[PDB]
Amino acid sequence: MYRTHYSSEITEELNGQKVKVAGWVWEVKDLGGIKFLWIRDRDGIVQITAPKKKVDPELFKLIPKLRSEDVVAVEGVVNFTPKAKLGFEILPEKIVVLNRAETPLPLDPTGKVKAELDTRLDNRFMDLRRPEVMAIFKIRSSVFKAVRDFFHENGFIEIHTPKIIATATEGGTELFPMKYFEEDAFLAQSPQLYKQIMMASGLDRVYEIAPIFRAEEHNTTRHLNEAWSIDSEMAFIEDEEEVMSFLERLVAHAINYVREHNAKELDILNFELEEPKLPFPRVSYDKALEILGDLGKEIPWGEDIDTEGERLLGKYMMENENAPLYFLYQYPSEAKPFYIMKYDNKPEICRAFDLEYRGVEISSGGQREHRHDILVEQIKEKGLNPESFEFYLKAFRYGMPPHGGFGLGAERLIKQMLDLPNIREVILFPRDRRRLTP
Amino acid sequence: MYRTHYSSEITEELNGQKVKVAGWVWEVKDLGGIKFLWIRDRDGIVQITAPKKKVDPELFKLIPKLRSEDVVAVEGVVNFTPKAKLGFEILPEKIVVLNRAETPLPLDPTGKVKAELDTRLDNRFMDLRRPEVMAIFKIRSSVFKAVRDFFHENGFIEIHTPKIIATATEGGTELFPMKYFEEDAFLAQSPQLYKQIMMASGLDRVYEIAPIFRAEEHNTTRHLNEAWSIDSEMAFIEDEEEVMSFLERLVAHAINYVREHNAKELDILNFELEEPKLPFPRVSYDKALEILGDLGKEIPWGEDIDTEGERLLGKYMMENENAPLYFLYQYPSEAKPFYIMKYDNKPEICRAFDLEYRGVEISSGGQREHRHDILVEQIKEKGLNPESFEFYLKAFRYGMPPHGGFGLGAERLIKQMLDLPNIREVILFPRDRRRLTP
Ligand SMILES: Nc1ncnc2c1ncn2[C@@H]1O[C@H](COP(=O)(O)OC(=O)[C@@H](N)CC(=O)O)[C@@H](O)[C@H]1O
Ligand SMILES: Nc1ncnc2c1ncn2[C@@H]1O[C@H](COP(=O)(O)OP(=O)(O)OP(=O)(O)O)[C@@H](O)[C@H]1O
Ligand SMILES: [Mg+2]
Numbered sequence A, B: 001m002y003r004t005h006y007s008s009e010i011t012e013e014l015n016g017q018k019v020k021v022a023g024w025v026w027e028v029k030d031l032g033g034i035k036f037l038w039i040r041d042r043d044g045i046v047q048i049t050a051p052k053k054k055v056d057p058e059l060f061k062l063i064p065k066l067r068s069e070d071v072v073a074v075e076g077v078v079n080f081t082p083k084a085k086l087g088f089e090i091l092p093e094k095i096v097v098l099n100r101a102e103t104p105l106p107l108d109p110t111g112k113v114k115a116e117l118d119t120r121l122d123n124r125f126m127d128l129r130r131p132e133v134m135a136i137f138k139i140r141s142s143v144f145k146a147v148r149d150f151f152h153e154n155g156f157i158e159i160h161t162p163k164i165i166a167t168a169t170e171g172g173t174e175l176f177p178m179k180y181f182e183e184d185a186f187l188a189q190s191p192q193l194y195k196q197i198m199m200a201s202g203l204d205r206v207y208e209i210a211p212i213f214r215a216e217e218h219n220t221t222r223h224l225n226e227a228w229s230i231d232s233e234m235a236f237i238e239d240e241e242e243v244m245s246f247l248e249r250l251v252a253h254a255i256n257y258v259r260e261h262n263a264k265e266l267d268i269l270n271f272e273l274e275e276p277k278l279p280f281p282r283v284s285y286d287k288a289l290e291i292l293g294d295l296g297k298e299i300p301w302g303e304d305i306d307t308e309g310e311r312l313l314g315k316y317m318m319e320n321e322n323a324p325l326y327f328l329y330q331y332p333s334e335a336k337p338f339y340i341m342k343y344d345n346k347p348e349i350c351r352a353f354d355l356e357y358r359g360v361e362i363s364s365g366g367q368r369e370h371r372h373d374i375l376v377e378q379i380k381e382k383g384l385n386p387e388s389f390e391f392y393l394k395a396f397r398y399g400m401p402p403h404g405g406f407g408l409g410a411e412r413l414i415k416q417m418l419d420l421p422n423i424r425e426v427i428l429f430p431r432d433r434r435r436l437t438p
């Protein structure tokens, strides 16, 4: 390997030892009798210091020839010194140019000249050379790990369900159709039917983290046509609050991992990520509509709360409860899918919920209707043909436990966690109405 | 929740304490003075013992009404006794019937009546109720976790890249075209182009575990049209051996994790999983052809090693070097993709390798050609159009370090690890030339 240590891995114990560092030329300063070369790697910059009397002359004359973003590797001696910005410098013995950069760069890695989002996405490899962008994707990786670790510690088994499918769906919208040899198929929008089917398997506690595909017809700052969904389903529950409790602890775990493990990245983003305060507040749909009504926002009882309503409620919950995260629940049954269980005692409302983070939905879930005949009737109530869901209904006939679950958008989670304005900031290569490349 | 403990979670410590167990009805003995009920959960069977003298008369009467595969929950007292074949029994206080099963069942969960693979695939929720099937999918989840943990321990950051793309990632054959609104697009055969682009970002060490899609024309025991690929790319390498070293370590780690954490599943499968022996043998393509020729299997230099050749080599390596896992490397450049670096001093061969597990390819990879102009010429040598790869080529112009990586098939790995005859055994809902549903 051309390096032994990243910038962040050199500590005082290495003082006076030889190391190899490598990265991209950040800055060269030829100051006469001394020259400086700064190299950027994933973790930051490292100072290479070349005093004329202390380095090989060919090294001395090479440094000024180095150009911005050239890829280089340096072998030299670690010298901890107060004179060094970051505590230590490397006195070079060997400098190798691995690969030379072309010279109008697509983006300015110093951030001085700022670029449009479009230009940045078109040139993502350059965009990540900026610490604030790298910080987001380090945090994305952290969130994924924290989520999986939490599932594992709680006895969940990872599953993988198909993305090329030919099943019916409730909405029949936003589908990406595709030919599958002789047959017609579509890309999956959610593993919903599959994870429910597996509740009849004994697996009991499953999760899947995998792409979902929805052909949204218009762009928003909150939607992508390709996204990563964190899906779970869990059996033998008594009510939807057990799913909500799990979900909030999961999200709090992800938040706390980022706070503990990515403080450097948070600092780079000039961002203070709040300590989660559990039980998040629960706000019934009835109460949410009342709050919205008093704000002059109309939503007729029975209809889903729209994007404006979420925004207003998010603001209200922050102002009144200092709560960045809260649940909407006890929705009208008519506003939620046929697979959600109704309150047997008050069937006009159902056991579904949405988790809101800074005024944007990050997850929806609920307890499902596991009783076959009631489920069938609910499909009918939606004006749909139960026969079209046969392959799924079949799993409810041979011993199906009560169950519930959620779908948690990874991009939504990260965008909202970091209070970023656009979801395109938290996925490397966005797909939207007009973006298909890179 | 309806349960507090799985069957596997009840130990001596809990003797005399109250627990809740739940699962599917496995057997009932309806006797005059006593009922015995056995329930099955994800981990095994639990005995419920109900002497008439000891239990609620309503509970005594209920047990004989239960039927195979009914879902039930039982609260009761743990009682360790030599008289229970599993070491303990539950003395029940309350039994709740959660859901009743229909007859006949789609498959026989007792294992007595054998079913064909197609029938089993059509009814996976039933199929997993058998311990030998559950065992595979528990092992699948363990393998994913082990792989991720190893990547993390070794400083790799998880990435996520598009599965809807404008340019085929692995070439013209075995490709799913798909319309993306007005545009022509395809499903990703691999994340190859993206993981390379990210080598110009500073991320340096990335992995992605995600679906890949290949429209295979033929139906075989070792191909699917949808699969999970474990991809990695790593920068600042000096040669492809560094990548092979990392891969064998990764695979060894996965195998040892299954050995350590899934012994019970290996037992159920009546399977001895061998302790990995690093380093695996490295066999050059030239030497492989010598070995085969010595065996009377003649492959003209430059041609692919066919499945027969793989089988013969696997057996030889198992016999000669006691190695279930070995690498083939230094392949003919003509037989490998444009993105592989040729040996500069011997251009007919290239820095590509395959990892073979019990005579079947489970991974391929290599050092990439990171030098822009040479890369372009290689795209041309393959008869392709460099302009179709502009977003990818752009990344090689502004400081690109040397790099290399691999794609490791999750299904291939698990199938070969457990010496299973058919790749459909290791993914819940396989997609092949003839299978699109469920
Ligand atoms: N049809 C299939 N069914 C089941 N599994 C499959 C199928 N096709 C591939 N795989 C698996 O993914 C690995 C890499 O794919 P390759 O085409 O060899 O290389 C590539 O795709 C490169 N980009 C990898 C690299 O150079 O990094 C295989 O070894 C295998 O287990
Ligand atoms: N087009 C998308 N882009 C990114 N994430 C999405 C998208 N569609 C759904 N998700 C997300 O997956 C989750 C569960 O899926 P769900 O069907 O409930 O979404 P949704 O109700 O349609 O979301 P929304 O109202 O914002 O369009 C969401 O709560 C969210 O985080
Ligand atoms: Mg939507």
Ligand SMILES: [Mg+2]
Residues within 6 Å of the ligand: A361, A364
């Ligand atoms: Mg919504």
Ligand SMILES: [Mg+2]
Residues within 6 Å of the ligand: A354, A361, A363, A364
């Ligand atoms: Mg929703």
